[PDB]
Amino acid sequence: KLKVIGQDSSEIHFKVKMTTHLKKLKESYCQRQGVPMNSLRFLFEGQRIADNHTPKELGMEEEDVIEVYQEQTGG
Amino acid sequence: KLKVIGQDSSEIHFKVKMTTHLKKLKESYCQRQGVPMNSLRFLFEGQRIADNHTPKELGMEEEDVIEVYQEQTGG
Amino acid sequence: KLKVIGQDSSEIHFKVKMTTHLKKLKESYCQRQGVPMNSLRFLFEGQRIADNHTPKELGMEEEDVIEVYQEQTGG
Amino acid sequence: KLKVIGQDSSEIHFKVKMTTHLKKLKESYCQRQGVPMNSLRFLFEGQRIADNHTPKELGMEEEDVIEVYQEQTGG
Amino acid sequence: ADVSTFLAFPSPEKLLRLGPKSSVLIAQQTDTSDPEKVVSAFLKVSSVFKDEATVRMAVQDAVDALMQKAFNSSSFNSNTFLTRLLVHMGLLKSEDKVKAIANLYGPLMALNHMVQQDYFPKALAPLLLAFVTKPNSALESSSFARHSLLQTLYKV
Amino acid sequence: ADVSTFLAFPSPEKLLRLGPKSSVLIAQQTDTSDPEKVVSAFLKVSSVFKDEATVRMAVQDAVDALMQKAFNSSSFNSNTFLTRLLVHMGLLKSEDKVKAIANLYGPLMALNHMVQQDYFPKALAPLLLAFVTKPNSALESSSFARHSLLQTLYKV
Amino acid sequence: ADVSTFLAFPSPEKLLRLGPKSSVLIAQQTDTSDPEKVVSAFLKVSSVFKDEATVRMAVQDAVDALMQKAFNSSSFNSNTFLTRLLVHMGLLKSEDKVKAIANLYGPLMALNHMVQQDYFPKALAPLLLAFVTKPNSALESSSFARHSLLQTLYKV
Amino acid sequence: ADVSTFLAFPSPEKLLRLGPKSSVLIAQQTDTSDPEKVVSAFLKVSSVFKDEATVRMAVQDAVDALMQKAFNSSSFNSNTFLTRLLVHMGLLKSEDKVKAIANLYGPLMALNHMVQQDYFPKALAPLLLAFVTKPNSALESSSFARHSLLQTLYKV
Amino acid sequence: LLELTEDMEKEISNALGHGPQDEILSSAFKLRITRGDIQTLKNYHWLNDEVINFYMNLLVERNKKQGYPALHVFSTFFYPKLKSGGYQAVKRWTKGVNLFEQEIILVPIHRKVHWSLVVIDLRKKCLKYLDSMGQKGHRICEILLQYLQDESKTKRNSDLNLLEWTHHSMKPHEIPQQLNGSDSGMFTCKYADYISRDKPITFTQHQMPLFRKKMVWEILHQQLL
Amino acid sequence: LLELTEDMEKEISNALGHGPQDEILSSAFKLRITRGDIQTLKNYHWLNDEVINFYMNLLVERNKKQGYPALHVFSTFFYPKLKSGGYQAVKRWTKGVNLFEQEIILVPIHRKVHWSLVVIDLRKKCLKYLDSMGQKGHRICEILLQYLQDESKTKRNSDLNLLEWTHHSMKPHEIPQQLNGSDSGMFTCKYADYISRDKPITFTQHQMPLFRKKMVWEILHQQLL
Amino acid sequence: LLELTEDMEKEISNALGHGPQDEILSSAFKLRITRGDIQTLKNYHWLNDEVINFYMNLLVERNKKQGYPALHVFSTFFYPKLKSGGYQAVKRWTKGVNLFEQEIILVPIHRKVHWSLVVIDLRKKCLKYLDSMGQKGHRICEILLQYLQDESKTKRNSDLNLLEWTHHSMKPHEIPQQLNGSDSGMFTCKYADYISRDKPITFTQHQMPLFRKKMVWEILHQQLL
Amino acid sequence: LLELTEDMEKEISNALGHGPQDEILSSAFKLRITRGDIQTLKNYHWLNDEVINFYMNLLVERNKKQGYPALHVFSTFFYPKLKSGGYQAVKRWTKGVNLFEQEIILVPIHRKVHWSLVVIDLRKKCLKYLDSMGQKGHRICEILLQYLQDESKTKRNSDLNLLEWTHHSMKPHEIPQQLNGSDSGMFTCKYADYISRDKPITFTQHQMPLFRKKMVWEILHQQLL
């Protein structure tokens, strides 16, 4: 059981068991969106959840929030 | 004693006695800003504080918040 | 009696007595044209007929041709 | 013996025997030019010398002039 | 399951590793009842384009699949699709141009004047000029798309 | 107290009701230690412009006051001023043009192709065309300012 | 005889040395039976414009004279006038744009490609770029007039 | 004798009916001592381009042949080539833009004013607008080439 | 149908023509519509926020002076605030009124360059999202609803069953769409002028220009015609 | 009026559609109309010189196969040459024919980006300059006339009295004008398709597009309809 | 000074040249820098957020492998979140570390199209806002400070006297400014590469291009040079 | 080298600055150089025909007041006329002078938007075509030569052997080329200021701007420096 609040409000409640990759949870989310993944990046309490990362190496708490932010560019 | 939080955070703490115009409190605020008044509009708990309006006809509570919003346009 | 063939063909037959200015014969021609004088310049057998110039200082032959050319620009 | 004066002056003196195609005389000319054939068209005394045409069906006089003109467009 | 993966985050090779079947594969795996999922798709597919026939053609043929399947169905509002596509390309909306211009008039009337006054430090003009000559102030984005689109519309 | 009032929210008449003294009045009541208050001013003053000599000239002469007083002082960074002015006019920054273009390439390559296919409903081209012909998709804002500015820079 | 002289070859001062009477003076001395003499006039008068109210206003008020007298008369084809004016401003005609573009497509497709190949001498790109950055390759003439005209047409 | 024929008057198929050998065939049959014959060639080859890989690639690969053979030789002025190419594409020269603009200023200042006066027949604005909306007054040729060229120059 | 009043047509051009950009041309509801403001009604211009917070208010009065459903209008600066400020930051907003007392609630909507309109028909117990650009809006309703639920179970302790509640986006083939990138402002007001009167959207593009004019008039006089 | 042939409409798109830009699509009069050429008839494109030297020739044949006035057509590359080459440089041009034998003479005209048409009605003893852009042309007639006078007093020693001769520009309010900067090509041919048949110019803009299509067809088959 | 490695120069063009736009070219800190990402370093392009969240991290390591002040780096997606989420919504952010233990804290800054940099020198007890565009930023520091005060009096109950604390914007005449509208990305990193090493900003524009290249290299190898 | 006169620099800006566009600023050779005219010397502007028919004349005088080769200058409106009017239409042009008496002949050249220069060095018995744009010009010389041959065998019955005569285009690697699309005007005058003095073209682009100024000065005073 989880959540993935975006840069807005959109609460897309999720669920999975703490062991296997989050990469699967990545594609999953970026599935029902208007702009791909590499336009987004997943952060959990700050640290940026890599793909090789696992809820098992993260120590995430069920019913936790995995915020997502959109690319930034400046010049 | 008052406040005028804008569409952002900027807390410009104010103060005046409940009787005289707010129009004076308008020009006052729009003084130290990057874009004039008519680009902004003053709302108090929702209702839009006209110029002819007075804290005396408003029933405002000292140490209250008079939010301000920027013009909107769509097409 | 004269002529003023332009950069094309247009034969605008003229006439005047050899003594007085040609400046009067200038404005005259540039009168019935689509672009002013300073867009044109008057040449007679080659030499460029100035304003201070006179048919009397030119030694022009009645029933002669005073060609006219349009400005040039390059870069 | 011939000539092919273009829309300018360029006298490219030619030569061939009155019998065989002029199409060969076409490509030939359009060879040493800055813009292809279909940008040009060959006229002889007015009538437009087709490819299927031959100096033998034209009754051309040696040391004659076969003028050439460039496409025109208006709107 | 190979289409969905590609769609998640497209890639030139991601499309190419679907062989000749990817064309109608994507097209059929995309519901055209609503003009949005269609655009949503039209975009992910072309978002892959790159000068290289392999990719070019793939995308084209691909798009054709989706668009034919698309047009051939009542449940399709080809006006909104079209519409909605122009807005994503920022060829439509994007800014209250009318107003945006209306604001510049002044600063523009001023700024020019200024440069022309004798008190304007000669060492400045060059900077100013050199400043609006840089690519971020020269390169036009949609004002470009738009022209290209017109050219084709006018057939040549 | 008449300058400050005008500045709060400018007006053609607001400036005109300051007579001939408004010129240096505004200029002197504006600290040029920092290039921002200056721009901040340069903008409010010109924001008033309207085709009508009365207003035109006022603003000009006005601006000249502020700008001379401005240039004549070490405490002034005429680079940042300049800079900072271009950004407000959106002649600088505003969008990652480089990227913005880079995205269109695809959808653009596609969208054109599409229109050209036989399956494209003839009744659509006209709509599309008529669509990018409307003023909100035709009128260019800064891409216009910029040209005007150049013309003067090139002296004619 | 003072109007005709001015018309021959206009001048800012040439118009100003006709006082307040020059306005309707020119307007009445110009036959509006044929839309050409009118344009012919409209042009000589405005050909004088220069940023300086004196001249500005003169011309305006002047033009207004000619144009009112003009519109108020059956013998006037305000379509051709209009037309004929756009062609002189080269806002119309001037080039077979359709074709002009059609030719570039190729050389353009090529030239870009070229620059992108590894065999393209790195020392060249900069030259090329610097080359199309110069004012004779940057400054747009009518493609500018046209925009200005639109802005007003759209009222703001 | 197959190269010369094609060059006389190019054709998509004319190039394609030279097989894979046409690439270096044309390139070698073109003397690069003088930058002109080269451009002269660069142009005839690309003048064939059309959206269709067959032709696209042919031309590219073709051009690459000519351009490598070209660059690799002292007898080559890659400045003039470049130069001379821009002039043919009318990206350079073509018009005294500086002057062209300088003339419009007046008629432009006038024409706008006019449209805005009350005496301007309401039935006209629409015509005028509709007039500069037509493709021969909207479609920009070189002012387009130029942008495309820049985009690539700026690498993206 | 209707036709224009030659004398009142020229009276509009005095409101839209040249002159001061601050010369107030109408007052009411605590909104002062100035030249600059009312100017946004010109052909192809984009309606600002006052030209709307107003017309949207004349709609309430016209529905109390011609007797139509209880109509509760919300301000343009409402949804945004709510979108980020939950209910807590909107509590004191509904002052002096029970929202559920009303029949219909009109909620204007500002997505950056766009004007949308959510109609919350309290009677039939559901809300409709009407957009003249085709653009969809599910998360919008979903959120707004969540305002009610709390505007209730917090401002009257009586909860709200979400089952009896519904919301849905009005498809492009249902309601009229716009054919440009300027008029979406009107499309939102006129969506209310009708939806409010329980009348069917039968209007379209080749009429909007006009709608614009009458609208400036309608606002001058404050008389909805 | 007329209506289009569904099958022959699609036959046009094969002449105007994609394909080779040299694939000759019609021959005659010694002019080969290729794809590139006939392509110039597309919407908004500018007619080249062959799409004209041809249609202008079908007009002659249609006026000898439907029996209309003796019609003598001149080539686009005629006036220009004459404009600079006097008569001497145009002598051998009128080969195998007495010009004054004819009733009407059609003369196309190329001003750089423009298509004009001079109609020299030999019968009524005068010529008319028809321009669809409003532009006037007095020096044009004045010059052309001067071709005749010499095409006579030099090619038959019999002079020509200029008094019995007249010329004049057809005002914009008389004939139809164009409303764009592309169609002046057609306006010149159709000016002949009628003026040739002594028929009044009753056509206009909201029809030209069509005129364009039939024209490509007309040229395919070489059958003027 | 420095000069480029002919072989490692060409190794850069393999990272910036054509190829896949996802082919990861470096990993670390939980950030995967792909082609697309590292591509943002090209001439005139705008640096994205990873090209920064990374270089800004190599700066920490280079200051622990060459021994410089305790350096605490914050992420690009930090300030924004804080700007709207107070401290409460940032609490769990500083996990596994006492911020005040550090000497210097680097905070990148994203104003929509701009890259700014706030340097919070914990030692001297004050923070500096460095902007390469001239733009000022008082409310930025004022806010950030307010993060500390609570990052303390809430994460250690020990308050914070604001008197001993200061902040100020670095004027345009102090630090180097940029002369275009693309390079502000670098100007922010290099502001750290130095400010971090307590070294004076002596660099300028006619060098940045280079800085860009080395930067892609620096990130390839993860070796700061 | 040379350096500018602070007081005479400001005297130039009075000739190039604002003011009347007809206020003659210099007279001589029957050419009146007005503001408009001399204005064409501004940065990036295109030199007109008088700024040249003049400087090209000061070159003659400077070569008779500093004693250089007999120099015969021809007008800008010369070649064109000749290009189309053979010799017959140019006969009376060379009035009061034997061309072959001269050593060097300077011939300016106008291709529509371009300024070229043909140098006919009568001494060495050949002519050189110098173009600062790379563009070649063989048919130009070939034609000009044909003017001489007749300017002789017709204006002195003494023919001309073409064998002893030569002409050739000066390659881009020989003479300096321009790096923009505005300065070709100067490149043609300065090609004469040197070629006239038998001096080698050693000048280039990063100097032309200046050349422009002195040139306006040079023309003010009519003193070539």
CA distance H96 to chain C (A): 7
What angle in degrees, to the nearest 10, is found between the helix axes of K50-62 and K184-195?
10
CA distance G1 to chain H (A): 24
Give the span between the Cα atoms of G101 and E21, in whole angstroms: 37
The string of DSSP letters for K37-104 reads HHHTTSTTPPP-SHHHHHHHHHHHHHTTTTT-S-EEE--TTTHHHHHHHTTGGGGGGS-S--GGG-SE
* Mutation site, C26, C29, C35, interface G, largest G CB count within 10 A: C35
Q: H-chain residues within 8 Å CB-CB of L182?
A: 98
Which of K167, K186, K210, K30 has its CA nearest to residue K116?
A: K186
I92 touches chain A (CB under 8 A): no
Which of I175, I189, I195 has its CA nearest to residue I48?
A: I189
Chains touching chain D at 3 or more Cβ pairs under 8 angstroms? G, H, J, L
Chain pair G-L, CB pairs under 8 angstroms: 22
Nearest to L44 among G12, G130, G135 (CB): G135
Only one residue has tokens 């034609």, namely L143
Nearest to B30 among F9, F40, F136 (CB): F9
Cβ distance A75 to K114 less than 8 Å, yes or no, reads yes
The string of DSSP letters for J19-84 reads S-SS---EEETTEEE-HHHHHTTSTTPPP-SHHHHHHHHHHHHHTTTTT-S-EEE--TTTHHHHHH
Cβ distance G156 to I39 less than 8 Å, yes or no, reads yes
Element (H, E) at G60: helix G53-71
- Assign residue K84 the CATH number of its domain: 3.40.395.10
Ramachandran area for residue B43 (φ above 0: left; ψ -120 to 50: alpha; else beta): beta
Nearest-CA residue of chain L relative to C48?
A: L30
Nearest-CA residue of chain J relative to G37?
A: J136
Give the span between the Cα atoms of E70 and H105, in whole angstroms: 50
Do B19 and B56 form a contact (C-beta atoms < 8 A)?
A: yes
Give the span between the Cα atoms of L170 and L139, in whole angstroms: 14
Which of A34, A60, A62, A35 has its CA nearest to residue A45?
A: A60
DSSP state at residue B21: -
One-letter amino acid for residue C34 of the chain = G
Only one residue has tokens 């409000």, namely A9
Q: H-chain residues within 8 Å CB-CB of E150?
A: 135, 138-139
Q: Three-state DSSP class for J120?
A: strand
Bridge partners (DSSP) of residue J115 are J110
For the domain bounded by G1-156, which CATH number is listed?
Answer: 1.25.40.200
Ramachandran area for residue E56 (φ above 0: left; ψ -120 to 50: alpha; else beta): alpha
Which of A12, A32, I137, I174 has its CA nearest to residue E37?
A: A32
**Break-preceding residues in chain C (C–N over 2.5 Å):** none
D52 touches chain G (CB under 8 A): no
Cβ distance K45 to F99 less than 8 Å, yes or no, reads yes
Nearest to G49 among H100, H106, H132 (CB): H106
Chains B and H touch (3+ CB pairs under 8 A): no
What residues 62-101 of chain H have any CB closer than 8 A to a CB of chain C? 93, 96, 99
CA distance C40 to chain H (A): 16
Nearest-CA residue of chain D relative to G93?
A: D75
- Assign residue D60 the CATH number of its domain: 3.10.20.90
Which of F134, H132, F153 has its CA nearest to residue G145?
A: H132
Burial pattern I174-202, b for ≥16 Cβ within 10 A else e, equals ebbbbbbbbbbbbbbbbbbbebbbeeebe
Cβ distance G10 to C36 less than 8 Å, yes or no, reads yes
CA distances to I81, I82, I105, I167 from I145, rounded to whole Å, are 15, 11, 12, 8
A45 touches chain K (CB under 8 A): yes
Burial pattern I91-104, b for ≥16 Cβ within 10 A else e, equals eebbeeeebbebbb
For residue J145, the tally of other CB atoms under 10 A from its CB is 18
Chains touching chain A at 3 or more Cβ pairs under 8 angstroms? E, F, I, K
Q: H-chain residues within 8 Å CB-CB of C73?
A: 96, 99
Ramachandran area for residue I191 (φ above 0: left; ψ -120 to 50: alpha; else beta): alpha
One-letter amino acid for residue H129 of the chain = L
Do E86 and F123 form a contact (C-beta atoms < 8 A)?
A: no
Nearest to D27 among H8, H10, H40 (CB): H8
Q: C-chain residues within 8 Å CB-CB of G7?
A: 31
Nearest-CA residue of chain K relative to B10?
A: K139
F101 touches chain H (CB under 8 A): yes
What angle in degrees, to the nearest 10, is found between the helix axes of F53-71 and E97-116?
60
Cβ distance F11 to I20 less than 8 Å, yes or no, reads yes
Phi, psi (deg, nearest 5) at residue G68: -75, -55
Cβ distance F134 to I21 less than 8 Å, yes or no, reads no
- L2 CB-contact burial (10 Å; exposed 0-12 / middle 13-18 / buried 19+): exposed
Q: H-chain residues within 8 Å CB-CB of K44?
A: 154-155
- Widest CA span in chain D: 42
Give the span between the Cα atoms of J176 and J130, in whole angstroms: 10
Q: E-chain residues within 8 Å CB-CB of F117?
A: 64, 67
Cβ distance C73 to L46 less than 8 Å, yes or no, reads yes
One-letter amino acid for residue F83 of the chain = T
Give the span between the Cα atoms of D38 and D30, in whole angstroms: 9
Bridge partners (DSSP) of residue D44 are D47
E124-128 contacts: CB < 8 A, separation 24 or more? E124/F78, E124/F82, E125/F153, E127/F79, E127/F82, E127/K179, E128/F82, E128/F149, E128/F153
CA distance G156 to chain E (A): 6
Do F87 and E127 form a contact (C-beta atoms < 8 A)?
A: no
Q: H-chain residues within 8 Å CB-CB of G68?
A: 119
* Total count of domains within chain A: 1
Give the span between the Cα atoms of J171 and J144, in whole angstroms: 19
Give the span between the Cα atoms of K165 and H138, in whole angstroms: 60
* Total count of domains within chain L: 1
**Alpha helices for C3-44 (secondary structure H):** 23-29
Which of K151, K150, K194, K149 has its CA nearest to residue K170?
A: K194
Cβ distance C73 to H96 less than 8 Å, yes or no, reads yes
For residue H80, the tally of other CB atoms under 10 A from its CB is 23
Give the span between the Cα atoms of K74 and K102, in whole angstroms: 12
Nearest to C74 among L22, L95, L114 (CB): L114
Nearest to A36 among E4, E8, E136 (CB): E8
Give the span between the Cα atoms of G3 and G18, in whole angstroms: 8
Locate the domains of chain E by residue range.
1-156
Chain pair F-G, CB pairs under 8 angstroms: 27
Give the span between the Cα atoms of D16 and K30, in whole angstroms: 81
Which of K50, K47, K68 has its CA nearest to residue K59?
A: K68
D43 touches chain J (CB under 8 A): yes
Cβ distance G93 to J46 less than 8 Å, yes or no, reads no
For residue D55, the tally of other CB atoms under 10 A from its CB is 22
Tally the C-alpha atoms within 13 A of residue F132's C-alpha that lie toward its C-beta. 29
Give the span between the Cα atoms of G115 and G140, in whole angstroms: 25
Geometric angle at alpha carbon I217, from I212 and I220, rounded to 5°: 130
Chains A and H touch (3+ CB pairs under 8 A): no
Do E101 and F144 form a contact (C-beta atoms < 8 A)?
A: yes
The string of DSSP letters for F19-82 reads GGGHHHHHHHTS--SSHHHHHHHHHHHHTT--SSHHHHHHHHHHHHHHHHHHHS-TT--HHHHH
Nearest to J180 among H9, H12, H136 (CB): H136
Which of B35, B36, B33 has its CA nearest to residue B12?
A: B33
Cβ distance A46 to K31 less than 8 Å, yes or no, reads no
Resolution attained, angstroms = 2.9
In terms of residue numbers, what domain contains A47?
1-75
Which of A31, J181, D65 has its CA nearest to residue E10?
A: A31
Sign, CA dihedral B51-B53-B56-B59, equals: negative
Give the span between the Cα atoms of H34 and H78, in whole angstroms: 10
- H74 CB-contact burial (10 Å; exposed 0-12 / middle 13-18 / buried 19+): exposed
Give the span between the Cα atoms of C55 and C16, in whole angstroms: 9
Only one residue has tokens 């002529």, namely C3
The string of DSSP letters for L68-115 reads -S-EEE--TTTHHHHHHHTTGGGGGGS-S--GGG-SEEEEEEEETTEE
Chain pair H-L, CB pairs under 8 angstroms: 39
Do F69 and F41 form a contact (C-beta atoms < 8 A)?
A: no
Geometric angle at alpha carbon L158, from L152 and L161, rounded to 5°: 80
CA distance F24 to chain H (A): 30
